[PDB]
Design a protein around this ligand. Sequence first.
Ligand SMILES: Nc1nc2c(ncn2[C@@H]2O[C@H](COP(=O)(O)O[C@H]3[C@@H](O)[C@H](n4cnc5c(=O)[nH]c(N)nc54)O[C@@H]3COP(=O)(O)OP(=O)(O)OP(=O)(O)O)[C@@H](O)[C@H]2O)c(=O)[nH]1
Ligand SMILES: [Mg+2]
Ligand SMILES: [Mg+2]
Ligand SMILES: [Mn+2]
Length: 664
Amino acid sequence: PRRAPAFPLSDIKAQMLFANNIKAQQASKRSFKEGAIETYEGLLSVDPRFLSFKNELSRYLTDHFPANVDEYGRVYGNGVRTNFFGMRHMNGFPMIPATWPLASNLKKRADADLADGPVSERDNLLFRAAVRLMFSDLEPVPLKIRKGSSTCIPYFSNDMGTKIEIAERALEKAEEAGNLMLQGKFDDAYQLHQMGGAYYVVYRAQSTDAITLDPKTGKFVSKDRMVADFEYAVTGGEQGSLFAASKDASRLKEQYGIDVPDGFFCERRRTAMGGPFALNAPIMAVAQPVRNKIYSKYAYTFHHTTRLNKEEKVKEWSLCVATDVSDHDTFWPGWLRDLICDELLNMGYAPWWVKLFETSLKLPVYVGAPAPEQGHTLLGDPSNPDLEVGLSSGQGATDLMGTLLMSITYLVMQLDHTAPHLNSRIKDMPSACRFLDSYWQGHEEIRQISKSDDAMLGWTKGRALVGGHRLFEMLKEGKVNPSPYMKISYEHGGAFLGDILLYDSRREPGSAIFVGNINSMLNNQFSPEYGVQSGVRDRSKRKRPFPGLAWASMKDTYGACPIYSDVLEAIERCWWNAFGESYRAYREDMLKRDTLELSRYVASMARQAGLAELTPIDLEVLADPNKLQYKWTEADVSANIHEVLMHGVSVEKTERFLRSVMPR
Ligand SMILES: Nc1nc2c(ncn2[C@@H]2O[C@H](COP(=O)(O)O[C@H]3[C@@H](O)[C@H](n4cnc5c(=O)[nH]c(N)nc54)O[C@@H]3COP(=O)(O)OP(=O)(O)OP(=O)(O)O)[C@@H](O)[C@H]2O)c(=O)[nH]1
Ligand SMILES: [Mg+2]
Ligand SMILES: [Mg+2]
Ligand SMILES: [Mn+2]
């Protein structure tokens, strides 16, 4: 029932997605590639000492610090959620094949029994009220662009000057492109303004993934990751198959002569979509202002920074429920995209801009190389965007889309199972708006803190509380999905935005605290997602600009973990056995070196002034700017630092553009 149309690279529809320049042409042909990452300068991820080290350290920590998570998924004690075997992957070598992205998720949602539109008028009112509170009184800001990022689509440029140009040109022609699309002229819009085309699909690494040790066999087992072949992806799952990707690393010996120790596997690979920059710029121009609004006015449920920032809110609750959403992005509903557009039109947003936005959520995807001998296929017709991939990762507002979907979904789950007495407060748009406004500010007896699919649901004392406990119990039994919109369950080892909520014997929000996830310290130091890219001169353009700085924020980020010291000591001891050196000393040097290299990028830094002024956040971000795209926002990072990583378009250019978009 409607297979998505598909075109090979050689087809003209695919060829037009790539400009006549070397970069674009190469991106279109890039074949499957693998190899050890350069974990740290001079250290390959498959280095025998390094794998020996990982073998001993993971076995030791698992053995001495088994998980402390109760039947309700709350973690207590040692603050450990699971074993430490996740670090056992040959980083840089992926599971084969990666998945083909689903062209349509309608069947996937229907088969999972999720609704195909708001199920009640109340719900419809709440989603629309969310659009209203989020997109209403926006203040222009400048359009910030990540240094070294690709404009993808037709040009695949990384040059800042070229990006700035593209973005400014896009803010000037967005209106005319939008109108062309309203007339059904997508090709004209793509050809004249590069707004359209496709998302460029690239596979990324989730460096660590669950592994277990079968006490029976003494053998390790990697978690199966299901992937869809092409047939399955273009037919929405109607045909083709869904199967376990192979994580088996034996092949590395045979193929590259790399020695594979027992119990080491290939990495899990996730899909990433690079959006066509001319189309995303007009969207990012509105999206940042929305973020500024929800982070300020609705800071209670949406602005999260420190462990204490979150702790303050949750400590006042009588019950805290850590939720989990299964595969959020691919389940995200296109009907919400259409509801949001509809409400934006109602609020008075420019039609051409809503059209740009709507189209960015229906765009075809160009699949590059999921496995050797596979790929180079465009899914969907750019002449008539109509894909239902769910939520595309590089769209300019994917975080807002997930947050709008989930924040309401969690509220609905609270109303449905614990606070029916609040329904009478939601009768129409005005009252829905008032109620959501109050709820989002933490003023109701039911509350939440969330960011897209990560969240914690709260109940203060009151009528809803007894329901809250029944909901939790429903989640623990896990036989009934509590939401009609997405598959929700409880997180096993509850955490929020990286911080584990540590409970004591009371097992209550009031006497619980937020600590760092010690396992993540280990993932970040021994299993980064990218190599150090030392051949890239401009450090600011690297995926990991200054790896050494994370050493200076380690105590800050993980100090509160019950087993912090023990882990540092096991590391030191295992590093000695593997490398005959002190790990601490190795890091202190890397920390000194990167501190000096940093002063060359920061103006306000003397050619050796210390890290004195920088916050823990600043450092974690300089060592891994990726956290700026899922954990923190420009606002949480010092300004002299933010300029190392980003550049912007003038406020006057975006101000004039915002004005033409908004109602008032
Ligand atoms: N580890 C991980 N998880 C990732 C992921 N992309 C998407 N997920 C999904 O997030 C949840 C929770 O996973 P968990 O390992 O329990 O905790 C993660 C997660 O909450 C968060 N996080 C890391 N990377 C991302 C990301 O790109 N997007 C989102 N939305 N959330 C992310 O950080 C916690 C700690 O991660 P870790 O210590 O492994 O550090 P990484 O540097 O490896 O993260 P990365 O994004 O790769 O740079 C589950 O549904 C999971 O499927 C991902 O990449 N890694
Ligand atoms: Mg999960
Ligand atoms: Mg990361
Ligand atoms: Mn969580």
